[PDB]
Write a protein that binds this ligand. Structure first.
Ligand SMILES: NC(=O)c1ccc[n+]([C@@H]2O[C@H](COP(=O)([O-])OP(=O)(O)OC[C@H]3O[C@@H](n4cnc5c(N)ncnc54)[C@H](OP(=O)(O)O)[C@@H]3O)[C@@H](O)[C@H]2O)c1
Ligand SMILES: COc1cc(Cc2cnc(N)nc2N)c2c(c1OC)O[C@@H](C1CC1)C=C2
Length: 157
């Protein structure tokens, strides 16, 4: 199983200066829950953003750099290597990966952040004409989680 994992705002911003533009613990708990015991694929920039392997799952980092050999982390140098990986594979970011994989994944788990932020990286445009809403569940707003947000599970029609 090949899935995208992404959080994006109303204009499909995903990134600003190699960080997330928003602070939203719920989303991060969601990511954790979904991908425990499974595999994350991710481009070098996103990994260096996170700065160390994510515990309790297989971290795979896609890079052109053949000197890459980080403890905790498996490296690949081709998009095609993704299809070799066993198990549930989540495409974890960032923009380059999403663009490369979006026509290939079986489904997407998306957090829509119901705000407009300044970004420098984006999720590719997509149509619900192409993608069916298997579930839509509103994040809960609270002291700690203060932007409206919706958990979409979409599956390719
Ligand atoms: N909202 C979210 O859910 C979310 C999730 C993840 C990331 N982000 C954001 O996304 C932004 C980063 O996106 P980005 O596109 O700039 O970076 P990125 O996708 O994380 O990484 C790009 C790098 O990945 C490697 N790569 C990609 N495709 C490759 C290929 N086909 N073959 C070999 N290597 C390949 C290359 O590394 P090398 O140059 O080393 O070869 C490339 O420079 C950040 O702002 C981050 O905060 C948001
Ligand atoms: C740009 O830096 C980060 C990028 C991601 C990828 C990501 C985040 N949220 C969602 N809904 N999907 C993702 N693929 C995550 C992240 C980042 O920095 C912290 O935190 C992780 C932490 C919660 C485990 C979760 C995903």
């Amino acid at each position: 199983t090949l899935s995208i994992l992404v959080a994006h705002d109303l204009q499909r911003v995903i990134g600003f200066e190699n960080q997330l533009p928003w602070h939203l613990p719920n989303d991060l708990k969601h990511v954790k829950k979904l991908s425990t015991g499974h595999t994350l694929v991710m481009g070098r920039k996103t990994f260096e953003s996170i700065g160390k392997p994510l515990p309790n799952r297989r971290n795979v980092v896609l890079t052109s750099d053949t000197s890459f050999n980080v403890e905790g982390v498996d490296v690949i140098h081709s998009i095609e290597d993704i299809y070799q990986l066993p198990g549930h594979v989540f495409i974890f970011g960032g923009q380059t990966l999403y663009e490369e994989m979006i026509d290939k994944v079986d489904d997407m788990y998306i957090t829509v952040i119901e705000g407009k932020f300044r970004g420098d990286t984006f999720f590719p445009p997509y149509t619900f004409e192409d993608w069916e809403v298997a579930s839509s569940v509103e994040g809960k707003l609270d002291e700690k989680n203060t932007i409206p947000h919706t958990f979409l599970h979409l599956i390719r029609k």
